Predict the 3D structure of the following.
Amino acid sequence: EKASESYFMGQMQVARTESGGGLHLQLTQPRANVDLGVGFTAAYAAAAL
Amino acid sequence: MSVQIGNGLLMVVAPGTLTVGSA
Amino acid sequence: PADQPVHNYMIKRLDRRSLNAAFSIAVEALGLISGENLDGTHISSAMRL
């Protein structure tokens, strides 16, 4: 639908670890969401097979 | 708009090894 | 019985997810980038590039 999901994106965080002489970076981005329509807002049909 | 001045900080903490060994 | 106009009050709770991708880096490449394995030669520039 026109706007069927509230969706929030966080601030990206990076965290490493010196495992074997070389860095090992691990990027991470927290994010959360919530529906924002009373009643149903999406539906599928299962056409083919 | 996300990459390397805190990913700056992050990689090259590198050129510091003594932090000398002597009092 | 003539129904009186009904009201209500409903709330909704967020859900929290995440994402993460990672990438490593070799052990001697790390010496090449910083400069501790760099030599004032004509080859090591090529490897650093």
Notes: The two ends of chain A are 25 Å apart (CA to CA). The interface with chain C takes residues 8, 20-36, 38 of chain A (CB under 8 Å).
